[PDB]
Amino acid sequence: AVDSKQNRTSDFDANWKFMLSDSVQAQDPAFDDSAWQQVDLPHDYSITQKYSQSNEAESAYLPGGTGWYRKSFTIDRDLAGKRIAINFDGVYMNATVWFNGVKLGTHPYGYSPFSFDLTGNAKFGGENTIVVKVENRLPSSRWYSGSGIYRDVTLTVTDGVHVGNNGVAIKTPSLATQNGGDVTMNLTTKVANDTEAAANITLKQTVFPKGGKTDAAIGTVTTASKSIAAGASADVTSTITAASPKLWSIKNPNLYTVRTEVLNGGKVLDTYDTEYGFRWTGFDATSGFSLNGEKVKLKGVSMHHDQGSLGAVANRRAIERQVEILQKMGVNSIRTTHNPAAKALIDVCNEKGVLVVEEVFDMWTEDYGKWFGQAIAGDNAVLGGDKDETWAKFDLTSTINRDRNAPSVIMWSLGNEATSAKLVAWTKAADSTRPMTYGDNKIKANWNESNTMGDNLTANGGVVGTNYSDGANYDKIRTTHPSWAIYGSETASAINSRGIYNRTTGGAQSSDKQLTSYDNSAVGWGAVASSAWYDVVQRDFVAGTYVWTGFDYLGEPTPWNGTGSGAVGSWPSPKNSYFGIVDTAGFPKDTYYFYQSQWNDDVHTLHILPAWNENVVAKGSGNNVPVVVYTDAAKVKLYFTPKGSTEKRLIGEKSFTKKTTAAGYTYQVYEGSDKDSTAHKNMYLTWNVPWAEGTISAEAYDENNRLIPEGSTEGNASVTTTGKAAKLKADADRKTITADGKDLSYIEVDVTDANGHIVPDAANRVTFDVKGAGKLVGVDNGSSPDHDSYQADNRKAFSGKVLAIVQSTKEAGEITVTAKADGLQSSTVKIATTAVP
Template identity: 35%
Template sequence: MRTPLILVALFALISLRVIAASPEPVERADAPPRERVSFNDGWLFSRTDAEWVLGQLDYAYSKPWLLASAADLFGPTSPRITQPRGNFGGHFTHTQPGFDDSDWRKLNLPHDWGIEGAFKQEYPGDTGKLPWWGVAWYRKHFDVPASDAGRRLVLEIDGAMAHSLVWLNGHFVGGWPYGYTSYQLDLTPFVKPGEKNVIAIRLDNPTESSRWYPGGGLYRNVWLTKTGPIHVAHWGTVVTTPKITADAAHVSVQVITDNDSAAKASLSIATEVFALDASDRKSSAPAATGAPVSVGIEPGRQASATQSLVVTQPKLWSVSAPHRYVAVTTISQDGRVVDRIETPFGIRSIAFDADRGLLLNGEVVPIRGVCNHHDLGALGTAINVRALERQLEILRAMGCNAIRTSHNPPAPELLDLCDKLGFLVMDEAFDCWGKGKNRQDYHVQFPDWHEADLRALVRRDRNHPSVILWSIGNEVIEQWWADGQEGWKLAARLAGIMREEDRTRPVSAGFNGEISGYNGFQHVLDAIGYNYRINEYARFRQINPTVPLFGAETASALSSRGVYFFPISDNKIDPASRADFQVSSYDLYAAPWATPPDVEWRAADAVPGYAGEFVWTGFDYLGEPTPYNADLTNLLNFSDPAEKERQKKQLEELGRIPTPSRSSYFGIVDLAGFPKDRYYFYQARWRPDLPMAHLLPHWTWPERVGHVTPVHAYTSGDEAELWVNGQSLGRKKLAKGEYRLRWDDVKYAPGEVRLVAYKAGAKWAETVQRTAGPAARLKLMPDRREITADGKDLSFVTVRIEDADGVLAPRAANRVAFAVSGPAEIIATDNGDPTSFESFQSKERAAFNGLVLVVIRTKTGEFGPITLRATSPGLAPTEVSLTAK
């Protein structure tokens, strides 16, 4: 709802505050040219919002003030935006520096309040049954040295969920509605150097604003940046590599400079390029040096200058060798350095070709990608670099080389890691445009904010070599319009905005409608990404022979790790594949709109030029528990208690207790980070040179003696022989269009199932499944034994429940309790069970099919040995030693 202008004006008058004029900035001679420091520590938090009267701080009232925060992100054809007069919200007690917040909770950022809450079945929707919505406040008291007088202080927020409003010392500064956009606010007019300063941030996360678990809070990093009045603009360096040969790479560095002083300035801009190693250390000597460029800049204006440099014998960035460089740009005035900024980048070329697919540095690179939502499982959405790195390591071992940021701008740290580790990225902006999918999702802000959000995304991320595709949206409703006229015109506008900011990458989207390949969208975008439209691949290629094609979202297969139901079927929605709110892990089952992996591959392999796929999803994620969402959500949303009870009783009679799941079943890896069987299916396809073989199901079925228990095998070989208790059941070869080997008539007998795989006639790999005895012991396996004592680093410890011979007890559900001694703390536990509603902060958890995860975090500045102890009734306790360094 749009607020009448007269009410906005009236509110401005009511809120009017007299703000003393800031002194003219004078740069300190002894100041470093630029300081960017973490602003994460020492915050106070409260969910109270007692003064929220008549919605005075909601979006309808705040919009005119918020839009001014994005003034620099609207193009020249957009109306000039200025902040209204007054002090929006300045009369609220929570914004005042003198407000007594002594009883508020103390915490450090990043912080997701939703992950801390108890699961509740009555929570609506498919968003994880956690309390992520509502209003919360964050306040921080901090000192600004008197020596910072005359400097420019900027608050940088990488992401705040959502509708953030920011005050400093009682004065409204700005904010941003979209919880995934990174933005900055100039604090300079309201800073008090030499005094205590207080910043207050209000967040309002609306209900029905997300289809998955979005988290809540200041869940990404916050920074304080200090510069002089003459400085490089926000995201003001643009590095491109327009010409690359084996002998030399031409590097173009555009530098946009702001002059916030009162006088015209004559500047000299110089850039050097250094090689970067894996630890971000620069080479001792520059790889290239550009001639200084002279620039004159008027007060209150921007200036742009471009330098061209040549790097000889360049080391190219690729998925197998992600070499990186850094451009170090220095701004000088009258021989004195006034700003210096470092911009990491990579030297590489990308192109999408309709006949060959993705070309990286001129070579065909199949996209072997996954889609991921932004939560980190038991850690919620609060960003943690080690948790992200662990996810990428698990995916890389599978053969994955690409990430689609579904369906929103990612944390900057994800792109930094992808740059370093050699992952390709499809960088996505939105889940919807003007037509919404939920009552309060992004479509509410789209008319006002799409341009600013798109430009912010591209400006922030355009120097990352990992980013190879921009995506303007996912499964937008506008794609379905019969003639596509309004849809493709809107797509053309959005793509045009992105191309204004970056012309080096193609623009695409994820389309789940077959019509999108024929109604104009294919002509305004640079490549078409289909979601679940395998029957359209061949037709699209025939009608659009020059348009690149890839799978933007594929498979949506369903499974629970280590769960198997019988009999099996090739019917992807077979009811027999589901029970107890779990889905069988034979990898034959998928959502109604989707396909098992091998069905997708069969269609893709038949289409020339298919560039590759992004599988839905790499990891399980909180929310969207297909296939157990719709009917149970409807049940719990019945307003009539009698009808609700009747439906509940009916489900109970059918053996279905109404406990909707907390998390998805789509992942190749479960929520705890444990691979499912499907992981090895993709590994067999994506790592054809890795000798590997995998068997399913497990072989511990005392109730199935003599019953048919099909055995399937995934291997990077081309044939295999199956042995059951020493007896061969035959050697089978993969035919064209086949990707798994099946022995569907095996009768279970305890003992051993062995697979010997061959490739080109030679023995290639071998694997075995053995019948497990009773659970006898715990085994602790940390992913890292040495962790940094910075209060952020993590060790993910896997707990295996084994029999006396060390065989995994694949159906064990023993409850395990944890205790830690030394300079560390337990911050989360999980088991990958989508039906578990135990708090992620619990220090104990039942195993799910033999596995448990416990996450250990160091304490800042505390060093030494750490001991993690695990106990379980009936099993011998065990310990593992770690070190905080």
């Protein structure tokens, strides 16, 4: 049902048919697909298949396969003469596209956007059929990719004379000094003349605050007449003087719409909008990163693309929720390891104020490595980037073309350890406004290839990323290469489960397929969170850090990882990662509050581990339990209240010492008499407390030695011995969502005792009854070795918590979700859905 009522670019996600099959040939329009599954995109056809130990642990034991997507739709007569194109923000992988039986082309890479023109084969005034074949033979990748059309699909309908796809490039080369007054904008606009007659057009271009009207423009320009031959294109340059634009920054992500109208005489033929933000960055070899002339430490996380129980589906609300949970931790930057992000993530970070280091590739047997250095066939009409060299150039320029105007994107990352020099040149030619980079692992060993490749980055205005360097290695790079601007492109790789306290050690396979929540567990080549941050926060020349990872992701379940088929350990084997600060369900681990005490200067943190039940704590020498406090306060007083008492007694008091760097960054370290012999562990506080039923509570004091109001800080300011499990506590993060068939509500359910305290080891199976104008689309507990179906109506809680994800329908109404558990009191939440205006 495509006609003239839809916008220039319109949502094309609804009403597809899907079939998983390696034998069908379903490209012909007359193919009978009446027995196929009916799905709304985005869609992941790996996440619904069963785990199998004949698959690979690194990709979560889930299969791939060959998936077919079909959509039959109408093109109304009122679109005769118009240009029509279908745009894929991502298809994993090896896509083949037919339109009305005619093959249009292929796209190997599973992570980059691409499009196809439909005009040449369209049946105007009749039925049309688009077919997409997806092939994921599952040697695959080092992490869970998912399979299928896992990102949004859109249709673009334009006049014959129109702005090209991603056709507007914006530069503000003097912003750093023009800031506050008139800012010069240099724009380049690609205008295509897909008619059979010569076109003579002008452009009217306007810059106005996002969501506003054109009468609020801070700058406009009309260009002189440009002649464009029939079937040709032209690059129209123009200059706008923007009157005192609001800068885009982390705290104030002010956004603008740059509207381009293609006029013929006094008639608008095409109107193209692009999102923009005014900001400039800088990387200094001595003092690190700056945003809008102000020094900023890159407090970053590496993030894979999948969304937990939803698989690879790039749902906008799922992505938005991730960024919001990271922001509460104090994260200000995301590295899209190791592939282009969904456009949805770029939109979210533009709106939320998060700096994005957008990575384009991982490395440089049937995977993308075969296609990286191959040319694009002459009869492959795929569109998106340059087609004159290799697929790598196409996918790189396609990503840059999509995101070149996004203010959140500060850097282009080219990979993660001849070809390097080619990628760097392609990036600089494609977008000169941002530095390029990559994460190099062999800089530690100081290979001659790393010295050369690092100098080549700097010579082209790039920034050097070093993977898993410690403080000594940071200093060696700084001394050996005084001209390099460096940062920790991949750090920490601590491995932890959520809610595990009966031991404080880890870093290797255990006996319960879980790992300690204490920050004493990391892979051999990595470091614990306190060690990786201590080395960065001391050094102004280390611009920042990108912790591996922010969220747990499917696949790579190190220390239970495995290349090749076969279970690692006893089945069911761990199938998602342990690197994340937050688990796949969005539930933070304990180290989340360490980072928050280090990074979030808008909140106060006071967090105690472990949970204070005898069957979950670790008893060391003298039956003492190691108690850890994460906090940003200057001083902490620790108390203990015996079970059945209302009076607390002081059991310790420790003050932080504040350190300041030359650039002005401040951090805290404990230098008391009983400090830890490992310096980085003194970024938090530790007490050895004898076990006894009761409550351990903490009070926070500021630099003036005065109390911080309790309850106003984040984290568990106290831990108490709980009773047995008695009731469930459900809570929806959003109690009203949009009835568009896309919006989600996340319902965390906690297992609590009769007094509401979370039972720290509770694993009761919780059943979800979803009624009304919504559907259950996922259940999750973040537990790596749990193989229960994400699409079931039930799941065991893990460490006292379980998650339910409900999706709206396209009819406004109410959703009722009841969480049930044998012997426990149920909990019910109600979510309203509101129609789209």
